[PDB]
Amino acid sequence: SRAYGAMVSCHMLSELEEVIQYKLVPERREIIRQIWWERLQGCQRIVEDWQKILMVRSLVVSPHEDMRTWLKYASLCGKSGRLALAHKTLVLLLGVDPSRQLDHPLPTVHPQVTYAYMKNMWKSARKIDAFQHMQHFVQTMQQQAQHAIATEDQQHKQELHKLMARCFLKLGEWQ
Numbered sequence: 001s002r003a004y005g006a007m008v009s010c011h012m013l014s015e016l017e018e019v020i021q022y023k024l025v026p027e028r029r030e031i032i033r034q035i036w037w038e039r040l041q042g043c044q045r046i047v048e049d050w051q052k053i054l055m056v057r058s059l060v061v062s063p064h065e066d067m068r069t070w071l072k073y074a075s076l077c078g079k080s081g082r083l084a085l086a087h088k089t090l091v092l093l094l095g096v097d098p099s100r101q102l103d104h105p106l107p108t109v110h111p112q113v114t115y116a117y118m119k120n121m122w123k124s125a126r127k128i129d130a131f132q133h134m135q136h137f138v139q140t141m142q143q144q145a146q147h148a149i150a151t152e153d154q155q156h157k158q159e160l161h162k163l164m165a166r167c168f169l170k171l172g173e174w175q
């Protein structure tokens with residue numbers, strides 16, 4: 001447990017070598033990203049360590065390029081009593097600020113990011129407006145899914161149904 005800090009340092013150095021591999025090899029990009037995700041999952045859930053590792057990985061990977069990792073990091077920060085940093089990460093992922101445009105409904109692009117932002121807002125005690133955004137998001141998801149159902153997009157439809165199931169459960173619990 002004492003050496004874990006130096007272990008984190010070794011993790012960062014190994015990540016840097018995999019970063020130069022990422023820059024050199026264009027066919028290794030997906031494999032490297034999956035390796036990074038699994039290794040980060042293996043590491044401990046300390047916000048400082050996660051921030052260091054993600055800062056190292058940011059050299060060749062923009063947050064938009066890998067939404068899942070930053071979503072997990074934002075969830076960790078939210079559970080670690082750092083809702084300010086979690087909101088900053090969520091707004092960076094979204095690309096626009098829902099806080100300034102309260103009247104403007106939440107963007108539908110990146111629905112996972114929108115759902116994460118909504119639940120963070122719920123944790124931010126803005127429950128009523130979170131519920132209104134939840135209803136708007138669910139109706140938008142259903143209309144979008146009905147419009148965009150196609151034989152080509154089936155995995156996307158399955159993921160959308162899973163997210164919608166989570167949204168309906170959250171709607172019921174919040175009601």
Ligand SMILES: O=P(O)(O)O[C@H]1[C@H](OP(=O)(O)O)[C@@H](OP(=O)(O)O)[C@H](OP(=O)(O)O)[C@@H](OP(=O)(O)O)[C@H]1OP(=O)(O)O
Nearest residue numbers: 071072073074075076079115116119162165166167169170
């Ligand atoms: O913190 P909660 O409100 O209870 O939400 C949890 C939490 O999601 P986050 O990734 O946003 O933290 C779980 O993640 P863990 O931190 O426990 O790893 C996730 O489970 P997975 O990691 O397996 O995705 C689970 O999702 P699910 O209900 O689909 O299993 C999800 O629950 P809600 O989305 O219903 O809030």
